[PDB]
Amino acid sequence: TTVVPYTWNVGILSLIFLINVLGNGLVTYIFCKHRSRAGAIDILLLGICLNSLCLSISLLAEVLMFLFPNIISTGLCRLEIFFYYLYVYLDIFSVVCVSLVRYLLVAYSTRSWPKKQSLGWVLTSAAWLIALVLSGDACRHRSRVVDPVSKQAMCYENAGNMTADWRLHVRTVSVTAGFLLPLALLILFYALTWCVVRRTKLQARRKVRGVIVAVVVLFFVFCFPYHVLNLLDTLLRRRWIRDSCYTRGLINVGLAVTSLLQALYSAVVPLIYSCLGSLFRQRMYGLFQS
């Protein structure tokens, strides 16, 4: 059985695509118009918008394949899954980079190099290269297959006699490289920032930045559930926890619910900037008053 009907899934993904594209395109436009006077964390926060825009192509492809089964082909199956994994890796990598740069802003406060655009660009490129490698590795075999039992085409993991091995390998790579290690690095950098602040008893000149914290919190809100349920699913398919029809159906429902949350983070991200950021709020308010 399928948990979310066709109509609900298509509508939700279409609305998410619309808001994603509009919000992150506008944010990137404003950022490119005011680039010259930006900092490292500004570049990272723009990188989050670029990550969200990656998902737009994936969702557009998926929606067009739903609407038009006729155009389902190997090329679209590759492209959709490529952009999907690109988004999934890039979001967590960008959060890790944000944590790294705030660590560096305190570890090297006496230096000026932690606060330049150069650090943001270097970190963004380092994240993008890794995400591209990981996504391209996964999107190699997904092609057009026809089920004998229903005589309809669909995107599938067909890889020959080794289809199951590839199916397991892709999920294992996703879990290990896109949830576990990035989370450990994130925790490490925040713990180091807190430790260095505690050890120095840094003065009250430290004052909170509204935008940075909200995005990091809403990431753990809208995206973490999908990754944890993916980990549970992969544990099912590796027989590290016990099999059961009830458990399988429970996780089948859960994956359906949480996958929509993770896609909704793309729409959530630009709205955080449009309200908690003074520059984005002003500019977008002026644009919308036109």
Author numbering: 42 to 331
Study authors write:
We optimized the sample for cryoEM by reconstituting the detergent-purified apo-ORF74 in nanodiscs (first panel). CryoEM analysis revealed homodimer formation in the nanodiscs, enabling structure determination at 2.9 Å resolution despite ORF74’s small size (~38 kDa). Nevertheless, the apo-ORF74 model from the antiparallel dimer showed a strong structural fit to the BRIL-fused ORF74 map, while the CXCL1 & Gitrimer-bound ORF74 differed significantly. This suggests that the apo-ORF74 structure represents a bona fide inactive conformation. An RMSD of 1.7 Å from their superposition suggested similarities between these two structures including the positioning of the ECL2, 7 TMs, and ICL3. Structural analysis of inactive ORF74 revealed a segmented TM6 helix, composed of distinct TM6a and TM6b regions.
Kaposi’s Sarcoma-associated Herpesvirus encodes ORF74, a viral G protein-coupled receptor homologous to CXCR2, which plays a crucial role in Kaposi’s Sarcoma development through its high basal signaling activity. ORF74 has been shown to have robust and high basal activity for multiple signaling pathways. In this study, we present cryoEM structures of ORF74 in ligand-free, BRIL-fused ligand-free, and CXCL1 & Gitrimer(Gαi/Gβ1/Gγ2)-bound states, providing an inactive-active pair of structures of a vGPCR, allowing comparisons and insights into the likely conformational transitions.
